Amino acid sequence: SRRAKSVEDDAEGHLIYHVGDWLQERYEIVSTLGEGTFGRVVQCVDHRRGGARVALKIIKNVEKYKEAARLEINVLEKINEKDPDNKNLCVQMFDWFDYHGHMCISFELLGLSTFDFLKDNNYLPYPIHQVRHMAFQLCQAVKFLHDNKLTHTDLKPENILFVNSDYELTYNLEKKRDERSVKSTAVRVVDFGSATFDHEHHSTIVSTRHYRAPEVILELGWSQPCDVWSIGCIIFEYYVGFTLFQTHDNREHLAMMERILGPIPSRMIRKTRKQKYFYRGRLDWDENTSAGRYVRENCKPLRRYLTSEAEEHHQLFDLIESMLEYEPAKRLTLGEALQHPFFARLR
Numbered sequence: 001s002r003r004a005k006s007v008e009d010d011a012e013g014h015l016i017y018h019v020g021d022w023l024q025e026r027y028e029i030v031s032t033l034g035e036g037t038f039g040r041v042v043q044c045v046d047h048r049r050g051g052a053r054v055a056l057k058i059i060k061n062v063e064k065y066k067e068a069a070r071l072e073i074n075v076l077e078k079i080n081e082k083d084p085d086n087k088n089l090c091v092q093m094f095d096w097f098d099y100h101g102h103m104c105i106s107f108e109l110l111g112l113s114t115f116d117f118l119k120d121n122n123y124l125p126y127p128i129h130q131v132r133h134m135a136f137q138l139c140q141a142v143k144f145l146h147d148n149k150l151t152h153t154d155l156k157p158e159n160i161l162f163v164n165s166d167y168e169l170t171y172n173l174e175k176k177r178d179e180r181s182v183k184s185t186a187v188r189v190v191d192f193g194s195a196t197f198d199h200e201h202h203s204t205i206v207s208t209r210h211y212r213a214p215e216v217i218l219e220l221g222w223s224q225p226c227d228v229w230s231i232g233c234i235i236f237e238y239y240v241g242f243t244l245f246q247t248h249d250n251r252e253h254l255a256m257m258e259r260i261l262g263p264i265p266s267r268m269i270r271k272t273r274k275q276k277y278f279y280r281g282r283l284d285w286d287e288n289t290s291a292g293r294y295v296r297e298n299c300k301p302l303r304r305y306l307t308s309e310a311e312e313h314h315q316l317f318d319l320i321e322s323m324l325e326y327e328p329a330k331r332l333t334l335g336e337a338l339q340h341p342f343f344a345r346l347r
């Protein structure tokens with residue numbers, strides 16, 4: 001899979017390595033599990049612990065991503081300190097080191113992302129019982145971070161991995177097709193390179209677009225509650241199998257929000273420094289442009305996404321709504337979220 005795509009695709013910063021290579025006379029590379037902006041994640045055998053398998057994030061040699069990693073490490077240090085028993089539901093770091101100039105970090109081996117599984121299943125949504133379990137663990141995992149003055153900032157299905165993504169095959173007679181279904185819905189949360197402590201500096205722009213919260217877009221300053229926005233977007237995505245906010249433009253994104261959730265409140269509209277997006281207390285957006293038609297055509301009021309009318313489904317959307325409250329101050333906290341009716345069945 002490590003084919004050069006272009007003349008611009010030199011091994012720029014990329015570590016030169018081949019399967020079989022040994023790192024620090026300990027870690028033998030077996031496969032490449034993924035790629036990213038930061039570099040690569042490979043599967044390794046830990047020969048110093050009886051051949052257990054691990055995942056090894058290997059960072060490019062570029063100063064931008066080196067610093068991100070430094071921050072990722074020290075967060076994970078802080079995390080293993082506050083919970084040496086590793087029941088938190090965030091991923092577990094084991095080790096970290098330099099090799100040939102590139103930083104490496106050693107995590108427990110997990111399965112595919114909730115995204116990947118979903119994509120590999122033709123976006124066939126998760127059944128509600130699994131949505132509940134995944135949502136629960138997601139909220140637990142992040143509550144933990146919030147309790148310790150942390151915000152993740154970049155939650156999304158790519159950063160929520162299954163412990164074990166082994167799956168049962170069930171053909172559908174009722175609808176004619178193949179349909180997977182994961183055995184164990186246990187998950188863990190990964191990627192702490194962007195995660196931020198309350199006292200540290202806050203980057204102006206923070207989540208992955210589709211999961212980004214209005215306070216961020218409007219540059220009103222953010223903190224713990226923007227994680228919750230993202231979580232709501234994720235939980236929605238799990239229920240219907242596609243992204244709530246499929247756009248790449250702030251104005252359009254704000255439009256979609258309005259269409260889906262109702263109008264943006266005025267406090268936010270006066271108090272933002274991004275006044276280009278508004279006019280006389282409303283979003284400066286024409287619904288009859290082709291953009292305007294696209295928005296109205298391809299998304300709709302939140303509750304029109306409900307399939308069944310069973311009580312448990314209504315509890316889900318109660319939860320989602322509360323999580324997608326426009327004002328961070330009023331938006332549901334994860335404490336409050338874990339107590340919600342929807343989750344009563346667990347605890």
Ligand SMILES: CNc1nc(NCc2ncccn2)c2c(-c3ccc4ncccc4c3)c[nH]c2n1
Pocket residue numbers: 033034035036041055057091107108109110111112113158159161190191192
């Ligand atoms: C399939 N087994 C597995 N895979 C993993 N990574 C899959 C992957 N990562 C990045 C890009 C593409 N694919 C991991 C990680 C880990 C650590 C850091 C991360 N940082 C940002 C994004 C994801 C990350 C995943 C921990 N345990 C794992 N087990």
